[PDB]
Tab-separated table of C-alpha atoms and ligand atoms in Angstrom:
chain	number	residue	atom	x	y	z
A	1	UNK	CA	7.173	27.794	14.002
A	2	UNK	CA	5.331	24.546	13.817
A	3	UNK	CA	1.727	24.642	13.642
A	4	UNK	CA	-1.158	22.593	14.406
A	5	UNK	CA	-4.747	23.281	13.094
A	6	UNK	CA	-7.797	21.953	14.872
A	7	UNK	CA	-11.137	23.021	16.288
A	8	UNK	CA	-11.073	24.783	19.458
A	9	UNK	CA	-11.857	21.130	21.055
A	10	UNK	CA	-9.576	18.075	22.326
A	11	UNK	CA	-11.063	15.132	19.343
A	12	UNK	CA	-8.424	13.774	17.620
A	13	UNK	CA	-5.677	16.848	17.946
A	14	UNK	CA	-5.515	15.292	21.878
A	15	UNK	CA	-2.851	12.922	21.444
A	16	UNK	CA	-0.714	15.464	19.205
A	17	UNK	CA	-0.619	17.973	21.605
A	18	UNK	CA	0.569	15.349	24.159
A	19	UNK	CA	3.580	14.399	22.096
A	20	UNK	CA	4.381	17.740	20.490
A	21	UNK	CA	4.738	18.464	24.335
A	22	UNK	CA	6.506	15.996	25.407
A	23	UNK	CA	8.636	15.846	22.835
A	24	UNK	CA	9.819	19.323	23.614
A	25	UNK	CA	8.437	20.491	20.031
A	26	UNK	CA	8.277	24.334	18.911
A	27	UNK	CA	4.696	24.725	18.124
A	28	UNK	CA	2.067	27.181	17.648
A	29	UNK	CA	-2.133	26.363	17.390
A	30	UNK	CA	-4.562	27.510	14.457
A	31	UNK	CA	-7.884	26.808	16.340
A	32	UNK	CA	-10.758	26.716	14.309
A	33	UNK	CA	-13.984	27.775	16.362
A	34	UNK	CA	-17.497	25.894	15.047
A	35	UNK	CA	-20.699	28.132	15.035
A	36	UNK	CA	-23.791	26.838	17.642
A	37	UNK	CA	-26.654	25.271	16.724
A	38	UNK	CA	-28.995	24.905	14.289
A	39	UNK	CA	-25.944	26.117	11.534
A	40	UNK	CA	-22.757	24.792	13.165
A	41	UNK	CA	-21.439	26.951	11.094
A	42	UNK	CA	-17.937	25.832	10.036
A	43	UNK	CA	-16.678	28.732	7.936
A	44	UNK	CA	-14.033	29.488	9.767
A	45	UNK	CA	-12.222	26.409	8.476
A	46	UNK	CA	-13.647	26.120	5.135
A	47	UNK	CA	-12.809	29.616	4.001
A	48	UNK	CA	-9.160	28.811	4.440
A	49	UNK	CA	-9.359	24.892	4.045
A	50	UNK	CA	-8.367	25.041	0.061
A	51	UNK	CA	-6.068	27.562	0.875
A	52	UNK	CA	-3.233	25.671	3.161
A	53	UNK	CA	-1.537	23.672	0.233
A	54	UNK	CA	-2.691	20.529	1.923
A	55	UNK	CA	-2.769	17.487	-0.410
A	56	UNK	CA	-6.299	15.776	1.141
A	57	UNK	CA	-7.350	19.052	3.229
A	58	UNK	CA	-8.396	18.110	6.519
A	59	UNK	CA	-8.091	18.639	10.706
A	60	UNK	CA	-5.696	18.309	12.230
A	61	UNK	CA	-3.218	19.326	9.940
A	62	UNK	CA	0.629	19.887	10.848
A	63	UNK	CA	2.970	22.658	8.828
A	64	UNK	CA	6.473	22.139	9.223
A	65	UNK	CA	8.119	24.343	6.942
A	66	UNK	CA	7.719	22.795	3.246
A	67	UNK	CA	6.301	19.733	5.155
A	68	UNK	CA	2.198	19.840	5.474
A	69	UNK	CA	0.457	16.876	6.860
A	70	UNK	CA	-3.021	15.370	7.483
A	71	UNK	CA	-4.078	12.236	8.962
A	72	UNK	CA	-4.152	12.486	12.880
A	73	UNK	CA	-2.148	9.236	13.052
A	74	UNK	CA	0.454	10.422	10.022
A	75	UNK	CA	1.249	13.554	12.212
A	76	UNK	CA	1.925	11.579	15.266
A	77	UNK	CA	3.891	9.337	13.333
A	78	UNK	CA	5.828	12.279	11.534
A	79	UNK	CA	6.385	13.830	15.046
A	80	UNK	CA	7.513	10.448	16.541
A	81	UNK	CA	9.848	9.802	13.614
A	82	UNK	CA	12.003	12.925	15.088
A	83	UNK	CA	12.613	11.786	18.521
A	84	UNK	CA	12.681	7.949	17.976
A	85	UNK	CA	9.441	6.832	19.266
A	86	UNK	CA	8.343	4.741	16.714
A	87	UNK	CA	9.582	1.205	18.012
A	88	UNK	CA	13.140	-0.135	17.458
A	89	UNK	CA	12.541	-4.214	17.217
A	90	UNK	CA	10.357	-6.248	15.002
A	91	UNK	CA	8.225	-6.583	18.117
A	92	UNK	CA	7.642	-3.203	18.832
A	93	UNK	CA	6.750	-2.559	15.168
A	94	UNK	CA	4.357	-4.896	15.295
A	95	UNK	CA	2.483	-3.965	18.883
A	96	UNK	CA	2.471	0.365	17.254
A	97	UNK	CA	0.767	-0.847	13.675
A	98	UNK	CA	-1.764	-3.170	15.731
A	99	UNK	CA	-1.968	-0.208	18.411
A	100	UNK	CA	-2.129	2.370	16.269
A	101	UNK	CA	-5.413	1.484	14.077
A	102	UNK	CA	-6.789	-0.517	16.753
A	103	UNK	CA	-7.110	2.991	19.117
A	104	UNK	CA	-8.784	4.607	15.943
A	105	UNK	CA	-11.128	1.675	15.908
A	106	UNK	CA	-12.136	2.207	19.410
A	107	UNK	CA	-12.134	5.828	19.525
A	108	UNK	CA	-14.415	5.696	16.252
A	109	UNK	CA	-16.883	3.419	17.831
A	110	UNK	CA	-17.566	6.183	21.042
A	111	UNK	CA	-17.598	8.785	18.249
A	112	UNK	CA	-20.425	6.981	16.329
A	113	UNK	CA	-22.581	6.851	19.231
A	114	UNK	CA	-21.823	10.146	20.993
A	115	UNK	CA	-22.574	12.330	17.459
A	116	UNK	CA	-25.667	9.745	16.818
A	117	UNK	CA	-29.118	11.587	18.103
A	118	UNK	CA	-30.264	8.252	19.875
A	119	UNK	CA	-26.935	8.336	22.088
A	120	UNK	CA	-29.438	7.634	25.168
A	121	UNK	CA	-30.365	4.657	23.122
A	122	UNK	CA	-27.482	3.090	22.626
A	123	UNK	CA	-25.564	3.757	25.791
A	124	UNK	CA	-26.780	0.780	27.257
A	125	UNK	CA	-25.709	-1.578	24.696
A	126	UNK	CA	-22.171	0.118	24.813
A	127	UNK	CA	-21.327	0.264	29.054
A	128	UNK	CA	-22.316	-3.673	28.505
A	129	UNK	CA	-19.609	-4.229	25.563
A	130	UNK	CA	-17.071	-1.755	27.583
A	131	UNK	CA	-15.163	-4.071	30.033
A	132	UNK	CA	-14.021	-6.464	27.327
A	133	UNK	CA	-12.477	-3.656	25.390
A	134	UNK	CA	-10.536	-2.800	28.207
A	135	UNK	CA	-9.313	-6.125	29.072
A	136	UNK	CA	-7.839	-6.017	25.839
A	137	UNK	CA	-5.749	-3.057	26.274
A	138	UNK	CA	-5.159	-4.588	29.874
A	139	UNK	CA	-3.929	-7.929	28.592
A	140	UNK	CA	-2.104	-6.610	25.833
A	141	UNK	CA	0.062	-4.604	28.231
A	142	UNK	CA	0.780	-6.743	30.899
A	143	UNK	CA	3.395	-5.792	33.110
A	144	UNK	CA	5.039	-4.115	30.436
A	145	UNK	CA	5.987	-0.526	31.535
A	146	UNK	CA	5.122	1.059	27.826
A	147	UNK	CA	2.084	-0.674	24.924
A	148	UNK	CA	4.981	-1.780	22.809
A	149	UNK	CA	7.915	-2.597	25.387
A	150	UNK	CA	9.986	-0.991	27.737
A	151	UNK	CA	10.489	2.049	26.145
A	152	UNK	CA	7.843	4.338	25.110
A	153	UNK	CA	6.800	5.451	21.821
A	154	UNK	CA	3.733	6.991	20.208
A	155	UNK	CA	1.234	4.666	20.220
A	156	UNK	CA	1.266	5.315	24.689
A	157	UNK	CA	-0.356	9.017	23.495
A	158	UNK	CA	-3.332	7.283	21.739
A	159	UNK	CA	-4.123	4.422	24.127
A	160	UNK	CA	-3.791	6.894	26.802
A	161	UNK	CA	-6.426	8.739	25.113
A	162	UNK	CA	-9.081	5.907	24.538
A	163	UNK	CA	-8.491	5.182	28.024
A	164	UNK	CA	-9.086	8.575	29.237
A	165	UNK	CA	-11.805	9.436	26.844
A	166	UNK	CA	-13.692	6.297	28.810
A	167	UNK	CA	-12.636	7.179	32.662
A	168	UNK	CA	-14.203	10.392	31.832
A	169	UNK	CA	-17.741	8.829	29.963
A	170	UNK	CA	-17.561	5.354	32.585
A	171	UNK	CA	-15.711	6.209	35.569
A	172	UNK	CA	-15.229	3.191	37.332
A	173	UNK	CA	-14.661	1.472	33.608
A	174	UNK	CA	-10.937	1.027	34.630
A	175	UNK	CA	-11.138	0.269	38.227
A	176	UNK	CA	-11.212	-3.988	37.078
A	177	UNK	CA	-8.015	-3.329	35.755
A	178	UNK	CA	-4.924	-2.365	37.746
A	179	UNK	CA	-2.324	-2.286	35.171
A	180	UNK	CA	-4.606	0.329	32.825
A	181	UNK	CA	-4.720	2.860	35.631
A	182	UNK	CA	-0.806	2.698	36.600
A	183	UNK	CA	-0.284	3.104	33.090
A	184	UNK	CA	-2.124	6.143	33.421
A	185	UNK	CA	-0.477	7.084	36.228
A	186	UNK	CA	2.983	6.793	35.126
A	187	UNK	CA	1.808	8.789	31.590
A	188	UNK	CA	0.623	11.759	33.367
A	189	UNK	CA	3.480	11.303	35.825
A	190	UNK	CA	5.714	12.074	32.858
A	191	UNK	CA	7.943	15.442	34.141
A	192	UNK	CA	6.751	16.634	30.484
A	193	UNK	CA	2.787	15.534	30.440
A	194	UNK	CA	2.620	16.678	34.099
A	195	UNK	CA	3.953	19.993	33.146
A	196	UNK	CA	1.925	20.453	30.166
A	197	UNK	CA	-1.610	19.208	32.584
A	198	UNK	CA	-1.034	21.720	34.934
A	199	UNK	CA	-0.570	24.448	32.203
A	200	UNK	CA	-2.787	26.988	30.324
A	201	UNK	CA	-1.996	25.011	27.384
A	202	UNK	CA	-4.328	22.111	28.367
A	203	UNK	CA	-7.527	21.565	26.552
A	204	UNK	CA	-9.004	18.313	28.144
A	205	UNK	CA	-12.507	19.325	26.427
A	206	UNK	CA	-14.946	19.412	24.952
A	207	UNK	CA	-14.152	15.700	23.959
A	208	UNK	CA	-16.216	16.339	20.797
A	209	UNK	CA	-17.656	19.160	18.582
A	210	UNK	CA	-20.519	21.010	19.989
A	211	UNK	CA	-22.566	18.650	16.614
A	212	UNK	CA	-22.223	15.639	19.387
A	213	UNK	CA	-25.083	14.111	21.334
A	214	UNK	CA	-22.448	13.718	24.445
A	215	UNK	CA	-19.029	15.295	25.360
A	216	UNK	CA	-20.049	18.640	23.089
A	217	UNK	CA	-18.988	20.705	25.833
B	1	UNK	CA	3.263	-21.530	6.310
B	2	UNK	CA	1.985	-17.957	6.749
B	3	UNK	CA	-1.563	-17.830	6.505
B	4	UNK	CA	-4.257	-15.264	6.166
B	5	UNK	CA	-7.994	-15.196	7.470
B	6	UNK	CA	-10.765	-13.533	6.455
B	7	UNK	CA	-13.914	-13.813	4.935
B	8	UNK	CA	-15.024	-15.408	1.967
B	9	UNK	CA	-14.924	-12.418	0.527
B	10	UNK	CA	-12.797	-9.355	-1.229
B	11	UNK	CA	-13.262	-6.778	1.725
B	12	UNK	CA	-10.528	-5.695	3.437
B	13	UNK	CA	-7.792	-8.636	2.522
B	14	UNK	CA	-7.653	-7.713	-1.015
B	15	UNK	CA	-4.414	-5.388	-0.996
B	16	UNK	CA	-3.147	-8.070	1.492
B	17	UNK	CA	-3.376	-10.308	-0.862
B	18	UNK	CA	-2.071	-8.355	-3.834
B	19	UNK	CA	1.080	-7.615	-1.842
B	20	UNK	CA	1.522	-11.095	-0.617
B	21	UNK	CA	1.332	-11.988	-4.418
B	22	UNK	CA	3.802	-8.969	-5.614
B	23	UNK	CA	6.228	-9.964	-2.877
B	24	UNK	CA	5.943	-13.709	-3.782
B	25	UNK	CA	5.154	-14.834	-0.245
B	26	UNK	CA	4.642	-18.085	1.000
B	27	UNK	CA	0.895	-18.276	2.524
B	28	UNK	CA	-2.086	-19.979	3.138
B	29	UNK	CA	-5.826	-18.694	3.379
B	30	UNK	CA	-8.556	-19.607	5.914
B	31	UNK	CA	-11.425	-19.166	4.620
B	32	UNK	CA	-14.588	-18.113	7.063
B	33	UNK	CA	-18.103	-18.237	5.552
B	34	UNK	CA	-21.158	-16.280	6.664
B	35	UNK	CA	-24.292	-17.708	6.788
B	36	UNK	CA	-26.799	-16.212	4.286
B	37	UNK	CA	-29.636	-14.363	5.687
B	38	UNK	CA	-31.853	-13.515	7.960
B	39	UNK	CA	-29.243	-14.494	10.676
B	40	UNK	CA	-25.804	-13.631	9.057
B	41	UNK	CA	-24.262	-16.442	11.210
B	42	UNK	CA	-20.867	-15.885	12.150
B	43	UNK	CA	-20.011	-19.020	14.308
B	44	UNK	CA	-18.040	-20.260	11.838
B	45	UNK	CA	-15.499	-17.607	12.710
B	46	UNK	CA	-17.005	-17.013	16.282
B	47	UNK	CA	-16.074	-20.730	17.415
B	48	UNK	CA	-12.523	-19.957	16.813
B	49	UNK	CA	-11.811	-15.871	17.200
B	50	UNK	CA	-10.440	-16.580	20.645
B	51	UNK	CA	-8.819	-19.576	20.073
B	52	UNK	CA	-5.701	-18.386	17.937
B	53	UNK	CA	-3.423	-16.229	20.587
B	54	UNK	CA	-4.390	-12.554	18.586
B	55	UNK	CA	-4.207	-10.045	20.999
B	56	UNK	CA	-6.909	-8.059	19.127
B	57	UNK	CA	-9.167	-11.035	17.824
B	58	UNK	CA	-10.136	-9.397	14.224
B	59	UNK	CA	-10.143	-10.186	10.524
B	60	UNK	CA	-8.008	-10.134	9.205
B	61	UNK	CA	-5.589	-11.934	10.776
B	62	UNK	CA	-2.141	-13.013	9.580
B	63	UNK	CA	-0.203	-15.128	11.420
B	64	UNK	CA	3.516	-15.935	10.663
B	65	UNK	CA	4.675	-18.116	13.258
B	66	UNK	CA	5.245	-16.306	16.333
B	67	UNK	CA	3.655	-13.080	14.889
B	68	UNK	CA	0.209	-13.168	15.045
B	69	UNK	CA	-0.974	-9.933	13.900
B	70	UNK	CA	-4.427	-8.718	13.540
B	71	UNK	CA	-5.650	-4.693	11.579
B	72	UNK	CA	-5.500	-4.284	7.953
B	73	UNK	CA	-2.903	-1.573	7.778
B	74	UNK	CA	-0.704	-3.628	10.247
B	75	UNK	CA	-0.920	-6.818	8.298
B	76	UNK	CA	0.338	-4.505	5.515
B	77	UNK	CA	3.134	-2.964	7.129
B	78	UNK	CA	4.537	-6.099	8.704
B	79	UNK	CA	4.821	-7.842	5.014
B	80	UNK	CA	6.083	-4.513	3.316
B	81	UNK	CA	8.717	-4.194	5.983
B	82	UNK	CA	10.376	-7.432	5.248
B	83	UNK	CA	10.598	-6.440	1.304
B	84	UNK	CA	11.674	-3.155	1.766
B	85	UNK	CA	8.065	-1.827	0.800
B	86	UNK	CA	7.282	1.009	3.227
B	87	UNK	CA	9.532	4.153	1.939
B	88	UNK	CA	13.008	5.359	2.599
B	89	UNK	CA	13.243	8.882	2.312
B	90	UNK	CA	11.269	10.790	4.996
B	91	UNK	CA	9.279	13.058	2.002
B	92	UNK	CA	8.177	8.324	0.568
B	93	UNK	CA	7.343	8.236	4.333
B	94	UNK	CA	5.279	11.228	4.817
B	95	UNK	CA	3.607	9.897	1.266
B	96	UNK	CA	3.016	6.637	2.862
B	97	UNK	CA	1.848	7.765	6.087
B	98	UNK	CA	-0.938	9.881	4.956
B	99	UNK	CA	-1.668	7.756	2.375
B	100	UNK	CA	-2.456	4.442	4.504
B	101	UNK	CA	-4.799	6.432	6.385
B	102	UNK	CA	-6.403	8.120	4.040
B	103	UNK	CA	-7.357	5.023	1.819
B	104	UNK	CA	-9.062	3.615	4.811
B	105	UNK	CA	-11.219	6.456	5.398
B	106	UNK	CA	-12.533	6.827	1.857
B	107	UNK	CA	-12.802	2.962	2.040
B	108	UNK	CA	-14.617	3.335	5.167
B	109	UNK	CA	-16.816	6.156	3.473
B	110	UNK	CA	-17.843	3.574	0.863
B	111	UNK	CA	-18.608	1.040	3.196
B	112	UNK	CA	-20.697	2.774	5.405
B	113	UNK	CA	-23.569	3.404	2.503
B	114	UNK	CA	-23.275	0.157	1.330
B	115	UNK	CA	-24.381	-1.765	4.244
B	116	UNK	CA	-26.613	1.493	4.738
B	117	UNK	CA	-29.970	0.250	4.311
B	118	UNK	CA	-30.635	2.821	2.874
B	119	UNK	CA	-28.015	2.566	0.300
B	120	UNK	CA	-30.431	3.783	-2.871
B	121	UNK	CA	-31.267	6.994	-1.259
B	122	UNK	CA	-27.740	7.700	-0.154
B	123	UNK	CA	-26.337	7.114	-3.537
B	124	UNK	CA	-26.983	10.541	-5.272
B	125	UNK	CA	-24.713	12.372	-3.039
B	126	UNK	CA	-22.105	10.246	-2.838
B	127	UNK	CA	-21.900	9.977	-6.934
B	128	UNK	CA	-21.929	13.637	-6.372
B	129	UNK	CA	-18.838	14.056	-4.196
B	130	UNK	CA	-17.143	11.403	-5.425
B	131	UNK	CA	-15.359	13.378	-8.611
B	132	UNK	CA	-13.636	15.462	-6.143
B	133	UNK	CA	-12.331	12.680	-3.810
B	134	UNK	CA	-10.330	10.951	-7.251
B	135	UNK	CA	-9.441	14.284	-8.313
B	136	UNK	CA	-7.301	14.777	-4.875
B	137	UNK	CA	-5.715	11.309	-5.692
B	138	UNK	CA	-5.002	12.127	-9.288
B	139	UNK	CA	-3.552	15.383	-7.979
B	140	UNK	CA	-1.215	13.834	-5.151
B	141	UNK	CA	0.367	11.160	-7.776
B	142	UNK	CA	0.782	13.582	-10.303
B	143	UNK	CA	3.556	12.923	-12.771
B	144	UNK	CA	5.209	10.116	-10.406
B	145	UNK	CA	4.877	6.341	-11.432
B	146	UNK	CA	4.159	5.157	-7.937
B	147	UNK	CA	2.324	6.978	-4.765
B	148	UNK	CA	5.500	7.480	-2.468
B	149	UNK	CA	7.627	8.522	-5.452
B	150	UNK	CA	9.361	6.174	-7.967
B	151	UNK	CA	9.427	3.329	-6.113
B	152	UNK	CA	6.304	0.974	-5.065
B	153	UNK	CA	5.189	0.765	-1.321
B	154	UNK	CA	2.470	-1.283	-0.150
B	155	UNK	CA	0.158	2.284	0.015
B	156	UNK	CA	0.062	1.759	-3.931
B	157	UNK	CA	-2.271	-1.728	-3.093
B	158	UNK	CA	-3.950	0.431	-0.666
B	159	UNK	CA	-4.817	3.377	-3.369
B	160	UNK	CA	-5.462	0.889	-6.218
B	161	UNK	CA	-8.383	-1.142	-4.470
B	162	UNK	CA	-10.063	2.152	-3.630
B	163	UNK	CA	-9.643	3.270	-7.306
B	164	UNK	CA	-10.901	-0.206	-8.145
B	165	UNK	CA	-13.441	-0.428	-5.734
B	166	UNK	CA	-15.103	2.724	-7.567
B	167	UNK	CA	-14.442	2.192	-10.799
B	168	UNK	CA	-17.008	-0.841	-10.147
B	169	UNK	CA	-19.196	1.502	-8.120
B	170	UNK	CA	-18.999	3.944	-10.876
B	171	UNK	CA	-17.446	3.134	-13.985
B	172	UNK	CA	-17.141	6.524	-15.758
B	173	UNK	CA	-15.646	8.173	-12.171
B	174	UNK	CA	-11.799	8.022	-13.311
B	175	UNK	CA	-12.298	9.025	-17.313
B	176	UNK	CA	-11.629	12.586	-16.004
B	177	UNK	CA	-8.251	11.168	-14.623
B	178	UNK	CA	-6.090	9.778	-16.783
B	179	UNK	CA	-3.024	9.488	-14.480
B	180	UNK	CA	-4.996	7.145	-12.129
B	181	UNK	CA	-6.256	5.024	-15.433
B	182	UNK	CA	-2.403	4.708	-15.961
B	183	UNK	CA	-1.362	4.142	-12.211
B	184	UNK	CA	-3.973	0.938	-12.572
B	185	UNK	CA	-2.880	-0.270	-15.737
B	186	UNK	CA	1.230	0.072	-14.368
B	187	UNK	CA	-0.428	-1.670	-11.131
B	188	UNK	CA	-1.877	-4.524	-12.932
B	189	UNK	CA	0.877	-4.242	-15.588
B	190	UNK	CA	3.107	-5.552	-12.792
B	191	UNK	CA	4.210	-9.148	-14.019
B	192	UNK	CA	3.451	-10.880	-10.356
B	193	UNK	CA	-0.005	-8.856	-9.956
B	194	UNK	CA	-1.172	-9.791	-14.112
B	195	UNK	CA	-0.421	-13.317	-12.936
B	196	UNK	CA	-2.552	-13.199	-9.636
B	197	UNK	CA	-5.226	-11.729	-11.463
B	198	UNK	CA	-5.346	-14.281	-14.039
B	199	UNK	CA	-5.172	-17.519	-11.379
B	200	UNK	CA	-7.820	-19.288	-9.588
B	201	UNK	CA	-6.564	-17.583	-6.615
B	202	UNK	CA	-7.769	-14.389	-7.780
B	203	UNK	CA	-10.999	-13.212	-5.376
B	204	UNK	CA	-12.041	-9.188	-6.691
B	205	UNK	CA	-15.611	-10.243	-5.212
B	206	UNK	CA	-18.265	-9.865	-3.659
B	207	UNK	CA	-16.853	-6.683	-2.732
B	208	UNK	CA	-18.472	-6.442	0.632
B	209	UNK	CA	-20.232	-9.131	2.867
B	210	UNK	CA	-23.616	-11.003	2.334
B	211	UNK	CA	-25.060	-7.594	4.849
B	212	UNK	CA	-23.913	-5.303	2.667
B	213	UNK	CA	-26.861	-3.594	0.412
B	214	UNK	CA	-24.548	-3.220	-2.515
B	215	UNK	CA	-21.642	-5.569	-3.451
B	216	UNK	CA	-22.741	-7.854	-1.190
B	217	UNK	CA	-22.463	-10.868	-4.071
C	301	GSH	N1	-9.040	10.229	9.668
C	301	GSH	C1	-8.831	11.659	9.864
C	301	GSH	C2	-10.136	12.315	10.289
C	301	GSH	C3	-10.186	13.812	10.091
C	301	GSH	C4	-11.558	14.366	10.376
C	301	GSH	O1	-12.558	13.648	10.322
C	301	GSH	N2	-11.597	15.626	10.775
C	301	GSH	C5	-12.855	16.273	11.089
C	301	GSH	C6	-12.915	16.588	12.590
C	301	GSH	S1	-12.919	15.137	13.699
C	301	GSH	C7	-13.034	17.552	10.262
C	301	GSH	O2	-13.742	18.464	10.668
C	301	GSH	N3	-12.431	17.603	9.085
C	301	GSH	C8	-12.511	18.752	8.194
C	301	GSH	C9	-13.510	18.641	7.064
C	301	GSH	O3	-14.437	17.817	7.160
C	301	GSH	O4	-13.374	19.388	6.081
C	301	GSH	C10	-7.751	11.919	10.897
C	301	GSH	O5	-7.442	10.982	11.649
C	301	GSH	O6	-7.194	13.031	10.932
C	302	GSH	N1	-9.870	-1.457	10.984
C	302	GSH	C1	-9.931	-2.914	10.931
C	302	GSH	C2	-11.381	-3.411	10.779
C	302	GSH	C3	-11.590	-4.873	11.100
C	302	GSH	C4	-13.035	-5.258	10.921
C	302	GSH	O1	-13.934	-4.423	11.035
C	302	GSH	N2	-13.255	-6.505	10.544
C	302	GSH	C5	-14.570	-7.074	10.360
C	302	GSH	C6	-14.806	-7.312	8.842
C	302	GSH	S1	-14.715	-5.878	7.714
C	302	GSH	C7	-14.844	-8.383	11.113
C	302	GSH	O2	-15.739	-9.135	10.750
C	302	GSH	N3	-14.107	-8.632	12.183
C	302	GSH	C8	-14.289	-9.838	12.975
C	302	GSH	C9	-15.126	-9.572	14.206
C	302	GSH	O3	-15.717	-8.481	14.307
C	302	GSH	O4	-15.201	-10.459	15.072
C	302	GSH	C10	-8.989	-3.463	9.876
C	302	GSH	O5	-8.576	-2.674	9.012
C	302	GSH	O6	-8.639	-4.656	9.930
């Protein structure tokens, strides 16, 4: 079947999962476990990495039969592709592209200070810039049901995972926003992603590797 | 008529720009300048982020009448789509896909030691992985005229301003490659792109902004 390689963590194979899921996708999972401290040791991967017949080698990866794929947001958009949730209208087009790298932009910038050894430091500076992220997300959704309409496509899997990547490191980060927390709501309320939660399947964390500062476990 | 903002700069509007030339596009460019140092003033662009309806206030920004549209890689897609510039077969798409991310990321990669400040001591082992990032490039065009196949998408402005970007960073780095020496000559070869180049429009540089430790002018 299908597989999907990754480290034995949620990081940027979160969203994937979600979709494969919901999408009702045959799948299997090559985890990749990472060695403790001071090594990290990351063997595991690398002595198999150049051996996968991946163009750019890299995780996550996606085999499909002759099809092998890299890029977290080109295997979404692979996946999505087959069960026509990549956006229909102009419109929706636009809202995934803008959706799509702005999520990576946001979910890079908790990266960079959760793997950075003055985390602590920086925290501060980051709570403070939070809310007007959000707002973003919040005012870019309005009382639309889905991020790029009414119907929902893939670009719901990755906000949903910004969002819940910052409920979990700022609790109360969404409470200023109603809309952001019925959208997460009616994502996890999805027959599918409610399933899927409640199964052995589920791998809500660690967030990041054990190499992070905060979230490695 | 459409028009395009971003710094006063090459950065990340350059294969915006190349593709708005190639597709013979009616646009317009604002222009932001940043102050020089020690204060890097922004204002310029600061006094007027969230006072043009972009859901995502960024630069670049392209806005086409209704469509306001804000991330690189969106800006991209949005123009490509209306010229028939992002793939057709699902093998182009796959191509495309995991090309537009990758590009970023060894863009990113680039930019992250050049507004290092410590850029110099950085250098040696970035010269030092750097053959093997072209040579998975070289390797993934192989014997095909374009990226995606034998047609151009807009990933092939995406791939040549990384291969340009280092071939200015390191001018020896794509002897070893002749394919991608050919893929830029066939790029700039391209009768709407050799007349760009050769206009007053034409912006290669600086590379990066005035913070920036290297190509910063
Ligand atoms: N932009 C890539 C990032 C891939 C990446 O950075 N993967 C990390 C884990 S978060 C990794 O361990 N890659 C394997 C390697 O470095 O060889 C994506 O979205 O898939
Ligand atoms: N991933 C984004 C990055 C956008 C970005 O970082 N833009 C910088 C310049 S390289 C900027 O100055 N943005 C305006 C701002 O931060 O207010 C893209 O591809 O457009």
């Amino acid at each position: 079947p299908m597989i999907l390689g990754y480290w034995d963590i949620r990081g940027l194979a979160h969203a994937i999962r979600l979709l494969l899921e919901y999408t009702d996708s045959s799948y299997e999972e090559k985890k990749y476990t990472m060695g403790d401290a001071p090594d990290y040791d990351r063997s595991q991967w690398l002595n198999e990495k150049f051996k996968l017949g991946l163009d750019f080698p890299n995780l996550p990866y996606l085999i499909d039969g002759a099809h092998k794929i890299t890029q977290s947001n080109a295997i979404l958009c692979y996946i999505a592709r087959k069960h026509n949730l990549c956006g229909e209208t102009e419109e929706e087009k636009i809202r995934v592209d803008i959706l799509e790298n702005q999520t990576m932009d946001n979910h890079m910038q908790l990266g960079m200070i959760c793997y950075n050894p003055e985390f602590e430091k920086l925290k501060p500076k980051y709570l403070e810039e939070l809310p007007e992220k959000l707002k973003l997300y919040s005012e870019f959704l309005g009382k639309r049901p889905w991020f790029a309409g009414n119907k929902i496509t893939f670009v719901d899997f990755l906000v949903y995972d910004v969002l819940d990547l910052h409920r979990i490191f700022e609790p109360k980060c969404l409470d200023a926003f109603p809309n952001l927390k019925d959208f997460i709501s009616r994502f996890e309320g999805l027959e599918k992603i409610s399933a899927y939660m409640k199964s052995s399947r589920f791998l809500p964390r660690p967030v990041f590797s054990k190499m992070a500062v905060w979230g490695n476990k």
